[PDB]
Design a protein around this ligand. Sequence first.
Ligand code: FAD
Ligand code: FAD
Ligand code: HQO
Lengths: 394, 394
Amino acid sequence: KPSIVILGAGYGGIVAALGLQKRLNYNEADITLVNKNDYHYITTELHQPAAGTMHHDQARVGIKELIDEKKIKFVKDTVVAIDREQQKVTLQNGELHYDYLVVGLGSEPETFGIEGLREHAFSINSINSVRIIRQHIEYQFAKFAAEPERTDYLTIVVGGAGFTGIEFVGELADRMPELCAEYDVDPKLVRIINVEAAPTVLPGFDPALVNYAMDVLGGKGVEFKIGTPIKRCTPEGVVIEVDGEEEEIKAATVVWTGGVRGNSIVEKSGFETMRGRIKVDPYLRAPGHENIFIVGDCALIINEENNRPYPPTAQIAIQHGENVAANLAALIRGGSMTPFKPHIRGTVASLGRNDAIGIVGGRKVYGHAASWLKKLIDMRYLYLIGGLSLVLKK
Amino acid sequence: KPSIVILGAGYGGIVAALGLQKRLNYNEADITLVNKNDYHYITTELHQPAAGTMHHDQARVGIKELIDEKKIKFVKDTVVAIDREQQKVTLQNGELHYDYLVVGLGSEPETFGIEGLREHAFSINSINSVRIIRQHIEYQFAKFAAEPERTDYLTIVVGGAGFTGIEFVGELADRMPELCAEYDVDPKLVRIINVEAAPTVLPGFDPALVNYAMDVLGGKGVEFKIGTPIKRCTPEGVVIEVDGEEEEIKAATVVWTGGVRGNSIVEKSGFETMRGRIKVDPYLRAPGHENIFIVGDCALIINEENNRPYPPTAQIAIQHGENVAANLAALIRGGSMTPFKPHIRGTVASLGRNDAIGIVGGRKVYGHAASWLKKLIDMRYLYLIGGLSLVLKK
Ligand SMILES: Cc1cc2nc3c(=O)[nH]c(=O)nc-3n(C[C@H](O)[C@H](O)[C@H](O)COP(=O)(O)OP(=O)(O)OC[C@H]3O[C@@H](n4cnc5c(N)ncnc54)[C@H](O)[C@@H]3O)c2cc1C
Ligand SMILES: Cc1cc2nc3c(=O)[nH]c(=O)nc-3n(C[C@H](O)[C@H](O)[C@H](O)COP(=O)(O)OP(=O)(O)OC[C@H]3O[C@@H](n4cnc5c(N)ncnc54)[C@H](O)[C@@H]3O)c2cc1C
Ligand SMILES: CCCCCCCc1cc(O)c2ccccc2[n+]1[O-]
């Protein structure tokens, strides 16, 4: 029996694994699924627990529940490095050998070398991280009543006005009334600030959607600072550049949604990478490796029409997983692989609990409709991996 | 018309104000009630929100609701000093003059000059403080999952094994299962440590009850270090003395229940004070001042039978308030005052939500019975100050 090793149980990894379990018969191969946690989390909704609008347990599921213990062997450990020559994967507590390898370790934050951003700012990339963000903000609001001169406790700075940042500041904006009521806080004193180095909010997106989103968020008191880069980050706050002059923002909380890169383990293992990402062949394999597959945020796909990269998304990650599952099955049985072509359908960005903006099939959508559509998509992924029972569980 | 000014709306202050409300007519005197908050909190239960076993709103009530808008004028401000000579009380937002003064500003923490104890340890003395404590602890538990090597996050040091410390560690012990469930924490790694400089817990209490309480709490994994004083306190933890040799405990959370003193305002105003408290005459007046009354934790009472001091408690504070109300009513109307005689009917100490120990009148009580007893006492105070409606609201 040949050995298939999947690193990371994210969208790409979980979809690849479930695909392989569905397609292959017993002892056709030995499949090992590796994750640093015994759970798989819904990354696309991680902004809600970070704000506290949703419990974090509703954003994750047990891996053992989803998979087949007979077909797939699950290992809970942390990947340290990959040795291409030895075809071996190093772990915190052991080592593994692969005939075939699928890499889906997802993304890690890119702080661009900005000072203090790594040490003193938070990221929305895991259950742990969002629990920390939530509890941090609650702690600051708790501290304010005893020390009312410190309005920096009530100031939250979100760096980067991208997809994630917009969704997050929307959730925070919705969370603020209950949060203020809980800690005897004057709602007027609260400051939610979204800071973008780029000249436009949601750069590379349709201006109508951007302006609508900006109007809605601004109505709920969210402030936007545009064309404003962050020079440095401290525990007290951030230093930004306005009109070519340094300016200071005092904030107990700084959340970084500025940029992401592929996992550093991949680059550190000797792969040639752009932004930590691998520009894979039409079969989603690593260039030079017939037995190594890259999925999700780790893989880089270029759009032949405009020669610009596809953004790192869960939507395309799932498709990577399905394609890799099929190609692995074919490779295992002697067959020919099918080239991967991405089909990018609608996309929705939430703006609080009851509002959203997005493009589906060329058709722009707003409000309650778009909100329900996004909820629908989430339910679709839940169904796809867990069935009706998983959707019922939440 | 004479002017009576009441400083602090605690047990003594609130009871005094309500008593004056019942006894006097609409123009017999001018009564001013001063508080730094617009609410009165149930100090005797503040340990529950501190652990997170109860919502903080269940520990407080609005002052304007309880009193009579016609009879008593309520001022929300923070007392700064009292000028005995001018008979004036200075405030953050104004000043007042008194013909008669009632001082019931309660207690402040006493750290005895132990290093770093004031700066880096928490106290259970207000709604704000317990919200800060609970959110702090939750924050540490939130941080643990990302850094499992930092077990100091799961270590809580409670200094002083008095009434408050014992009740608090009991509440923490009950709180730990849900807390651990919330943040993916192994309960075995959690350490709750109660540190006492004295060789025995709860001096002046029945040793059977004490040993029983320690047995019960010890069953819940609570650690006791007795005869161990705290040499100093740091953000990392505390430094204690064992066998005349220094030892270190690494703890993210340190809560001080070691000692209390009378409000520092009293001492700073030129009054003669012992432990920040005033040894009052049989009429609860300040020695040398016929128009100044001291109540609650600010007042020091000695038992004439055995010459030992009465501990600063809510029960005796309430009794102080009623006595001062009666005596002031007599003084304004030309009558004879009655000396204060304290009647201590016993007190019960909780050991988590479902356990307690206590002596009532003469009968020793354990378990669910004692727990229900404590709840009943709470109901008694609630009825006494707010009527049936106050009890009904909770
Ligand atoms: C708030 C937020 C909102 C988003 N909304 C959308 C949306 O609406 N639509 C959309 O298309 N995309 C959205 N995305 C992007 C989407 O979530 C990611 O593109 C998706 O996670 C793809 O990443 P992945 O499949 O490669 O794996 P990931 O989701 O990144 O998961 C990687 C897995 O591997 C584990 N892991 C990582 N390193 C190791 C290691 N050394 N050892 C062991 N295990 C490891 C991790 O614990 C994790 O389980 C959003 C992202 C965020 C943060
Ligand atoms: C966990 C805990 C459990 C306890 N259990 C019991 C028990 O079971 N039985 C018992 O008899 N006793 C118990 N006690 C003790 C009791 O709570 C206090 O002794 C009680 O509060 C009496 O103090 P006080 O009424 O004088 O003032 P406090 O109740 O302490 O407060 C005085 C009021 O004045 C306000 N104030 C303070 N300073 C200022 C200022 N400068 N300006 C304006 N306002 C101010 C405060 O906000 C407060 O509202 C317990 C105490 C604690 C912490
Ligand atoms: C149900 C009809 C709408 C179809 C659009 C789906 C495209 C789409 C868009 C997303 O933003 C996704 C985010 C996470 C997972 C899947 C996603 N999908 O599948």
